[PDB]
Amino acid sequence: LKSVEALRQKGNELFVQKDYKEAIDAYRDALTRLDTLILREKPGEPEWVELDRKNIPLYANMSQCYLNIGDLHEAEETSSEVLKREETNEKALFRRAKARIAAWKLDEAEEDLKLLLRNHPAAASVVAREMKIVTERRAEKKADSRV
Numbered sequence: 001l002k003s004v005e006a007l008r009q010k011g012n013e014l015f016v017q018k019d020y021k022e023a024i025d026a027y028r029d030a031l032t033r034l035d036t037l038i039l040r041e042k043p044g045e046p047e048w049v050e051l052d053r054k055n056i057p058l059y060a061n062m063s064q065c066y067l068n069i070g071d072l073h074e075a076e077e078t079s080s081e082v083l084k085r086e087e088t089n090e091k092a093l094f095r096r097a098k099a100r101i102a103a104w105k106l107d108e109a110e111e112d113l114k115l116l117l118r119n120h121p122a123a124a125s126v127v128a129r130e131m132k133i134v135t136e137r138r139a140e141k142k143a144d145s146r147v
Contacts, residue, residue, distance in 0.1 A: 001037060004030045004054070011061060020065040027062045031055065056082050063095050075099040088119040097130060104141070106134050 011026035034054055041048045059081040066075035076099040082092035093116040100109035110131070117127045 004034045004037075007033070008058060008061075011058075015061060015065065018068075020068045024062055024065045027058050027065070031058050034058070053085065056085055060089075060092060060095075063092070063099075067095060067099060072099045072103040076103070088115065090116065090120045090123065094123070094126070101130060101133060101137070104137075106138055106141075109134055 007026050007030035011023045011030065014020070014023035014026060034051070038048065038051050041051060059078040063075045063078035063082070066072075066078060076096055079092045079096035079099065082089050083096065086092065093112045097109045097112040097116065100106070100112065113127050113131055113134075116123050
C-alpha cells in the first residue's frame, strides 16, 4: 500500500524529466500491486471504493504519458478509466479529446469538449482552440473525399 505510493512517486519523478516510457512502466507496476490489494477486498464495499479511487491518479498520469509518446489508443483508454470513476473530470476529458482528435475520432472529440465546457465553463478558450482544430479537420477530410 506504501509500495504503491512509492512507485506512483517514481513515475511522477520520471514524468517531470520527460522520460515517459519508464513513467508508464512505473505507473503500470503501481497499478498491478494496487490490483492485488483490491482483489482481496469484498467487492463494492466502502473499503473497495477507497482502494479503487487510487487508480485515478495512476491512469490520469499514464494517459498523458501515452499522449506524449503517440499511443492514442492507450491515452484514450486510460483517460476513459478516469472517466469511468469521475464522469466530468476536467483533465481526463481534455486529454481524451486530444487523443481522439489526433486519432481522427472527430464526432467523439467534439462530445468530450462539449461535455468539458458544460461542466467547466473556464475551459472556454482551450475548448475554442481545439474545436477549431476539429472543425477544420472535418473540412479537410470532407473536401478530400469530394475530390
